[PDB]
Amino acid sequence: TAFLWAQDRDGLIGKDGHLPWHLPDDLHYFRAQTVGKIMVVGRRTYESFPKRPLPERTNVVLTHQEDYQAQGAVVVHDVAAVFAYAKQHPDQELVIAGGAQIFTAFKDDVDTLLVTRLAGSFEGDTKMIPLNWDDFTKVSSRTVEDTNPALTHTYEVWQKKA
Ligand SMILES: COc1cc(NCc2ccc3[nH+]c(N)nc(N)c3c2C)cc(OC)c1OC
């Protein structure tokens, strides 16, 4: 599995559904880390989208309620159903974008950890869960400085090893 969430040093991850800061570059990297692979999102992250569903990519939704409905999307209701669908499609991959409940839902079968740190401080309402970094190892990284110092961030790429 692969994780990917945008959080700032203030332990933030989002705010009012959309993000608290404006990072056009990070918003363009999402389309690059979603096409070709399966995009797994929760119900709060689904409606949080602008013009859903997202085309050019799979749209899965994990929910334990028989009331939520999604037209043109694989509504899964079990962790085995999400992994069972990935087995039939080996050409694609599993990627977690949110919400916080979806991350901890697949935190057990997690492998890669793509975290986007931002130098600019931003306060919101939702925070990121406590990941066990004492069980991972760095392998690659990509630093990038925007026009404003606060708009500075770095894509850290870690890999599980045991
Ligand atoms: C306000 O603009 C937008 C906001 C969001 N919010 C969710 C969001 C934002 C950045 C993200 N960045 C990375 N690295 N990975 C994610 N998983 C991710 C997600 C899940 C998502 C958008 O497209 C889906 C979008 O349009 C650009």
Swiss-Prot record:
CDD domains: DHFR (cd00209). Residues 1-160 form the DHFR domain. Its EC number is 1.5.1.3. PROSITE patterns: DHFR_1, DHFR_2. The record marks W21 as: May be important for enzyme function. This is Dihydrofolate reductase. Signal peptide: none annotated. One of its GO terms (cellular component) is cytosol. Monomer. It is an enzyme of class 1 (oxidoreductase). It catalyses: (6S)-5,6,7,8-tetrahydrofolate + NADP(+) = 7,8-dihydrofolate + NADPH + H(+). Methotrexate binds at D26, R31, R57. This bacterial strain is resistant to the folic acid analog methotrexate (amethopterin). Key enzyme in folate metabolism. Catalyzes an essential reaction for de novo glycine and purine synthesis, and for DNA precursor synthesis. One of its GO terms (molecular function) is NADP binding. NADP(+) binds at residues 5-6, 13-18, 42-45, 62-65, 79, 97-102. It holds the Pfam family DHFR_1. Pathway: Cofactor biosynthesis; tetrahydrofolate biosynthesis; 5,6,7,8-tetrahydrofolate from 7,8-dihydrofolate: step 1/1. Belongs to the dihydrofolate reductase family. The gene is folA. Keywords: Antibiotic resistance, Methotrexate resistance, NADP, One-carbon metabolism, Oxidoreductase. Substrate binds at L4, W5, A6, D26, R31, R57, T116. InterPro entries: DHFR (IPR012259), DHFR-like_dom_sf (IPR024072), DHFR_CS (IPR017925), DHFR_dom (IPR001796).
